[PDB]
Amino acid sequence: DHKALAARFPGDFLFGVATASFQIEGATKVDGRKPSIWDAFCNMPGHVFGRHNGDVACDHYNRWEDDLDLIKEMGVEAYRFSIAWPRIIPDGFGPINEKGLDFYDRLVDGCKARGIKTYATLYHWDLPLTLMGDGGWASRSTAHAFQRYAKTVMARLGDRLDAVATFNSPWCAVWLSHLYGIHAPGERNMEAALAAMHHINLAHGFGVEASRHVAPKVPVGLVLNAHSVIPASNSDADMKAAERAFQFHNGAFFDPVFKGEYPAEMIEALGSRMPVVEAEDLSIISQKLDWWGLNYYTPMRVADDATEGAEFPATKQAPAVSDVKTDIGWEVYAPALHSLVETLYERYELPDCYITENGACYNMGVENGEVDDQPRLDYYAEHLGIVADLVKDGYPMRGYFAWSLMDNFEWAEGYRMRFGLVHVDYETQVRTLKNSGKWYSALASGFPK
Amino acid sequence: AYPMTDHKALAARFPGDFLFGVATASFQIEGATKVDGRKPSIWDAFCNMPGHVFGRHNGDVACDHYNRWEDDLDLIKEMGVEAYRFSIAWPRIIPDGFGPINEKGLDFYDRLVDGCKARGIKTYATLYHWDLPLTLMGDGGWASRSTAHAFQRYAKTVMARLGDRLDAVATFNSPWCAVWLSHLYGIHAPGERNMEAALAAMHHINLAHGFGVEASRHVAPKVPVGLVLNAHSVIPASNSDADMKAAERAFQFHNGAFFDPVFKGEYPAEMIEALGSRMPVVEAEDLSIISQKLDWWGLNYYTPMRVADDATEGAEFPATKQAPAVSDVKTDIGWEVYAPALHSLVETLYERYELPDCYITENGACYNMGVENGEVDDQPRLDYYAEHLGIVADLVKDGYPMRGYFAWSLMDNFEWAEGYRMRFGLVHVDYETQVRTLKNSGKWYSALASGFPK
Ligand SMILES: OCc1ccccc1O[C@@H]1O[C@H](CO)[C@@H](O)[C@H](O)[C@H]1O
Ligand SMILES: OCc1ccccc1O[C@@H]1O[C@H](CO)[C@@H](O)[C@H](O)[C@H]1O
């Protein structure tokens, strides 16, 4: 019941919907945009399901106003979107593409008018391909490229943006992309990943400084998919493994940003293969933030891996406890969100928290002009319940963004996996609000109270 | 009779018109990677991403040939070598792969070619020696058919400017490396390990070659066009039926993937049976384009490929494994020295295919000794040359149309995944000072080559 749920949130609570540039925009060669590492990743056989690419996506570059009208119609207060660096500075470094800035200029103006709050993400994984020439994120220069990019974007949009985040999910851009080979640019090398790790942390810090110089009134944050690490058993071995996993998967980012240091045990094992950490780096990385964003979907269950020569954190996947799974295979276990936030606030000195992503893959389509996606509605009801619990416990939860306004390109899964509150038929580009979306609209429309 | 030097005795075994040359490739020697409109190649990316190249060595400086090319040409001249084989950097000519032509890039090679003409050095240009513009990766690189058309336009652009003076042109150097080593084995840029990607690269590079042949003859019909291939001398571990059949599968996969389309207008049958379903679309005119008649072809040879049958269940075609060397003689990069494998390879190729004239376009050895007392005593490299050149002379005597030979490396340079650690040059380069020092093997090769054309 959406109305009893609404009663559990403070009157000024911020409800939003969220989106990413490469996932929805399409128009990949339009108005001066040059390729991103994801264009290359999609088009090389092997990396992405069906060799699906971002060429058309949801055609949001052309349909952006219709999509803003839809958000307004749903009565959702905030919109979180990302900015395509390949549109703004197509070669990473080099000339600014003013037509690229124009698109986000119109977008933000469109939101301003409609009373929709704007939460921009500067980097949601679409690195300009040209920067790979220098080594991509493995090169320190790429952080300075971002520094210039951040300044350029905020100089134009800073007078109107309600909030900005430098990065979305360093874990993905770092390990999943450079150690595990699953995301662009698809590397599997610890040296490359440790380089990307430090350089993305550094770029974050550069972005905070850049944004505050050109747009000092805009609250600056960082969006992280902190993993809810759960040991497989209560053994000493699994307990210690859970901590190693926490340091590597979360601590690699939270510790430099919020404590100004890398995790000690991780440095002990991996430090010799890290790039140069210069004298000022950790102070730049750990500048104070106005907010932070949590992306949460599913727990990370781990067990000790005793295999000789296993690299830190030396763990392996543990089986799910719940038997409820989404259509992408991810375990549904809401309590893990509670224990995660509790853990983070005990361990770190953190600012206000917004849930910047939470949602579920369920692939049902249209019948009778409707989409009966009850399990997605149940997923939302259950996790929002947890957020309300966290509010009751005294945690500074200020808002919530449902992941995915619409069905879109889902990275290595291509278009086969649907996360949207709004269904998209890729043949016709018709948007159909799903039942979960009608429910979320019903909840969000009562805020501010 | 009275004592005679080995090089003089050797020179007598070659016809008077035999062509001796030295060879280089753009990314290995040029440096100046961000000057005059050049944009990154897949090798700039590959070098700078940790894990791909020794020491993360890159091509930013190399031998600084872009700035020292005239000095290097004067060295060729002093050596009395008739021909120079070099490659042209697509990233300098059309920096985004497609898109605007970079006149400054063309100008460098225009001046280079004029400089060779001025010195009486014959020019053999290679259009593609692995430095694909990075921007083309956006479309899928060699996995995308569009890339063949990008090369086509590039080829036509270069030949329109240079065709009035080039003595010969080759479209590609070593399809095997650009294809399997780069897209299946993950050792060369762009470092993929995927059979679908590799088979796409295979067909589109074969197609690009054909496009390049047509393009070059369209704007420069006088210039002899060829293709440079590292054909592998496949040697079975035994005469067992299992090993003989394995050697044939190996030949089809490693050589036939390229020789059959180019010289027979078809892909190898057994290969197609195993891999055909994962190949890209082959359009109606594709094999006809690929199989245009060539004026010459180039053989790159270094070491044999020894194989035995791999009986492991499900092993991917050609399902082979490594067989042991016959010699314990190896170069500093680890490659078996076995010169007679050059003879049997050439025998085999001329029986199996109808081929034009042959030029040995690469042959040489990795030996890493440096300068002592003003000299480089690289006797084992000299011996490598003396022995392999003996085989080449044997081939001439045996009736094969071997028209020339290019020593691989003019100078020490960037050696792909090995970085600057592996030296292949006839000329030593001290990378701190950029000083060139002709090695003893280089002095020997000069003494041989100086007498030609007789
Ligand atoms: O595979 C990406 C991913 C894995 C684990 C945790 C967060 C993740 O990231 C999120 O995943 C979603 C689903 O593909 C994406 O739509 C979002 O853009 C992304 O931020
Ligand atoms: O690993 C490259 C390679 C392997 C097997 C056959 C030919 C090869 O490529 C050759 O190898 C030489 C040495 O690294 C290079 O200098 C030449 O440019 C190249 O054509």
Query: For residue B365, which ligand has an atom nearest its CA?
Result: 2
Tokens of A307: 């295999």
Element (H, E) at B122: strand B122-128
Q: Is B118 helix (H, G, I), strand (E, B) or coil?
A: helix
Interface residue A141 vs chain B (CB under 8 A): no
Interface residue B37 vs chain A (CB under 8 A): no
Exposed / middle / buried, residue A308 (Cβ in 10 Å: 0-12, 13-18, 19+): exposed
Contact A335, A398 (CB under 8 A): no
| Cα–Cα distance for residue pair A266/A311, rounded to 1 Å | 10
| Cis-peptide, bond into residue B221, ω within 30° of zero | no
- Please say whether the structural domain A2-445 has been given the CATH code 3.40.50.720: no
| Cα–Cα distance for residue pair A382/A405, rounded to 1 Å | 19
Query: Which residues touch B289 (CB under 8 Å, ≥6 apart)?
Result: B207, B210, B211, B214
* Overall size of chain B counted in residues: 454
Q: Is B175 helix (H, G, I), strand (E, B) or coil?
A: helix
- Please list the residues that pair with B380 across neighbouring strands: none
| Cα–Cα distance for residue pair A168/A357, rounded to 1 Å | 10
Nearest Cβ partner of A195 from B39, B50, B135?
A: B50
Tokens of B293: 């008649």
Nearest in space to B339 (alpha carbons), one of B314, B360, B317: B360
Q: Phi/psi of residue B97, each to 5°?
A: 90, -70
Ligand 2: which of B52, B177, B384 to mutate, most ligand atoms within 8 Å of CB?
B177
Question: In this structure, is the dihedral angle defined by the CA atoms of residues A408, A414, A418 and A419, taken in order, positive or negative?
Answer: negative
| Cα–Cα distance for residue pair B49/A191, rounded to 1 Å | 9
What's the gap between Cα A14 and its chain centre?
Answer: 18
Query: Which residues touch A401 (CB under 8 Å, ≥6 apart)?
Result: A15, A16, A17, A18, A78, A80, A119, A293, A354, A355, A356, A357, A358
Tokens of A100: 């690229």
Q: Is A31 helix (H, G, I), strand (E, B) or coil?
A: coil
Nearest in space to A326 (alpha carbons), one of A378, A279, A277: A378
Query: Which residues touch A197 (CB under 8 Å, ≥6 apart)?
Result: A170, A174, A175, A252, A253, A274
Contact B137/A40, CB-based, under 8 Å? yes
| Cα–Cα distance for residue pair B67/B48, rounded to 1 Å | 23
| Cα–Cα distance for residue pair B169/B177, rounded to 1 Å | 19
Query: For residue A123, which ligand has an atom nearest its CA?
Result: 1
Tokens of B400: 């094969």
Domain residue spans in chain B?
Answer: 6-450
* Overall size of chain A counted in residues: 449
| Cα–Cα distance for residue pair A262/A248, rounded to 1 Å | 10
Q: Is B310 helix (H, G, I), strand (E, B) or coil?
A: coil
Write down the experimental method used for this entry: X-ray
Nearest in space to A124 (alpha carbons), one of A166, A178, A158, A96: A166
Tokens of B183: 């897209």
Q: State the Cα torsion B351-B354-B359-B365 to the nearest 10°.
A: -40
Query: Which residues touch B120 (CB under 8 Å, ≥6 apart)?
Result: B77
Element (H, E) at A380: helix A374-392
| Cα–Cα distance for residue pair A414/B200, rounded to 1 Å | 21
Q: What is the CATH number of domain B6-450?
A: 3.20.20.80
> For residue B315, what is the DSSP state?
P
| Cα–Cα distance for residue pair B282/B200, rounded to 1 Å | 10
Nearest Cβ partner of A44 from B40, B45, B143?
A: B143
Query: Which residues touch B187 (CB under 8 Å, ≥6 apart)?
Result: B181, B417
| Cα–Cα distance for residue pair A9/B277, rounded to 1 Å | 57
Tokens of A75: 């009565």
> For residue B198, what is the DSSP state?
H
Side-chain-side CA neighbours of residue B96 (13 Å): 11
| Cα–Cα distance for residue pair B351/B343, rounded to 1 Å | 13
CA distances from A76 to A146, A360, A437, A439, B329 (A): 31, 19, 11, 12, 75
In A232-347 the beta strands, taken as DSSP E runs, fall at 291-295, 300-304, 315-317
CA distances from A271 to A69, A198, A310, A314 (A): 50, 11, 16, 16
Nearest in space to A47 (alpha carbons), one of A416, A313, A414: A414
CB neighbours of residue B59 within 10 Å: 25
**β-sheet with A315-317: strand ranges across:** A229-231, A300-304, A315-317
Query: Which residues touch B441 (CB under 8 Å, ≥6 apart)?
Result: B376, B378, B379, B381, B382, B385, B426
Element (H, E) at A392: helix A374-392
Interface residue B304 vs chain A (CB under 8 A): no
In B310-384 the beta strands, taken as DSSP E runs, fall at 320-322, 357-362
Contact B439, B427 (CB under 8 A): yes
Contact A302, A222 (CB under 8 A): no
Tokens of B141: 């690189």
Secondary structure percentages of chain B, helix, strand, coil, to 5: 45, 15, 40
Tokens of A196: 């990307």
Element (H, E) at A196: helix A190-214
Residues of A whose CB is below 8 A from B192: 44, 46
Q: How far apart are the first and last CA of chain B?
A: 22
| Cα–Cα distance for residue pair A132/B41, rounded to 1 Å | 10
| Cα–Cα distance for residue pair B176/B181, rounded to 1 Å | 7
| Cα–Cα distance for residue pair A69/B112, rounded to 1 Å | 61
Position in ligand 2 atom list of the atom nearest CA B187: 1
Contact B369, B376 (CB under 8 A): yes
Element (H, E) at A237: helix A236-246
| Cα–Cα distance for residue pair A373/A367, rounded to 1 Å | 11
Resolution of this PDB entry, in A?
A: 1.8
Nearest in space to B173 (alpha carbons), one of B188, B162, B163: B188
